[PDB]
């Protein structure tokens with residue numbers, strides 16, 4: 001009933017039609033799949049793959065010759081994970097899923113179910129209990145990095161994702177952008193703004209499942225170069241993964257970073273400017289990369305949204321905001337798709353499944369050409 005073609009072109013009438021449908025009593029009562037449904041469905045992997053329409057064969061030789069690794073950190077919403085995995089799944093790639101140690105038993109079993117169906121999807125060999133804004137969020141990605149670097153020698157790039165991400169490019173287009181990177185990494189990395197300093201000048205501790213400022217003053221970072229500011233999300237070469245897992249100075253930086261607030265938002269940005277890190281850029285601010293100029297992740301921050309022809313980096317959210325981040329509505333997609341980033345965040349089947357559906361369809365159609 002929803003014309004996804006009109007949605008992707010940005011037709012206000014079709015968008016309004018989605019907005020109205022979302023408001024109905026009938027929509028909010030719609031039947032949802034449970035983690036138990038997934039435990040059930042994945043007993044028969046052949047039928048699960050067929051039914052859910054995973055892609056079982058690589059689409060081009062170009063893609064076959066360019067394997068990609070993914071690290072996916074999740075804790076809930078099994079249906080969104082299955083949609084995300086299906087959208088990015090290729091037989092030649094690798095997928096490590098980190099399930100939060102605190103997640104529900106049934107969710108963890110459902111993730112293991114899905115993973116058991118694929119030789120190249122698997123659960124991280126070590127799980128962290130992930131506390132919001134803490135080191136354990138970084139630690140989750142490092143765990144996956146460790147597994148992936150050991151399991152195969154031939155993948156080119158690692159991309160980290162969360163459970164509520166969605167691709168806005170096909171595998172083929174991602175591979176081509178990565179080939180265009182020429183062994184360089186790509187992620188946000190900008191001069192540290194002075195209002196983010198309280199996050200690492202002080203020691204933070206977990207008090208009652210919650211990361212809190214102790215007020216204790218930290219030693220300076222063990223680094224010649226500056227700290228840089230960025231995001232949790234990155235696109236990095238295998239050689240970078242290797243270096244970071246084994247280099248001693250990087251290790252000291254990480255150990256120093258453990259008791260900071262949101263270390264994920266400076267750790268990667270910072271390492272990317274250390275000389276000798278594979279794929280790194282010089283620390284000169286001429287090479288700084290903003291979130292819009294990097295390709296890693298398109299994200300809309302509430303306080304930045306506005307009139308793009310008036311200086312706003314992107315137009316207002318059409319979904320809803322959660323902690324200042326736009327969760328995308330169908331009205332966001334048109335503009336989003338003209339951007340160069342590989343993935344976007346956040347989506348949510350509970351808020352606007354029509355956004356995901358149209359994006360999902362468009363990408364599958366586009367790929368099968």
Ligand SMILES: *[C@@H]1O[C@H](CO[C@@H]2O[C@@H](C)[C@@H](O)[C@@H](O)[C@@H]2O)[C@@H](O[C@@H]2O[C@H](CO)[C@@H](O)[C@H](O)[C@H]2NC(C)=O)[C@H](O)[C@H]1NC(C)=O
Nearest residue numbers: 031032033034035036037038039040041042043044048051
């Ligand atoms: C596993 O699933 C099958 C199919 O159930 C359907 O799909 C599921 C994912 C979920 O959405 C269910 O609500 C759907 O009905 C189950 O087989 C069904 O069993 C019910 C109850 O006896 C029956 O009414 C249906 O006709 C059956 N459908 C089919 C296709 O056989 C099955 O019971 C589930 N098994 C377990 C162990 O939970």
Ligand SMILES: O=c1ccn([C@@H]2O[C@H](COP(=O)(O)OP(=O)(O)O)[C@@H](O)[C@H]2O)c(=O)[nH]1
Nearest residue numbers: 073074075100130132137161162163323325
């Ligand atoms: O209890 C939690 C909460 C968060 N996460 C993960 O941490 C990452 C970041 O979560 P989110 O994007 O919601 O944090 P925020 O958007 O508020 O910065 C995601 O991969 C989540 O799956 C987690 O593993 N356990």
Ligand SMILES: *[C@@H]1O[C@H](CO)[C@@H](O)[C@H](O)[C@H]1NC(C)=O
Nearest residue numbers: 002003004005006007009011
């Ligand atoms: C959806 O809209 C497009 C573009 O306006 C139109 O060409 C197409 O026929 C429509 N699809 C259906 C099945 O109604």
Ligand code: NA
Nearest residue numbers: 115116118121
């Ligand atoms: Na597996």
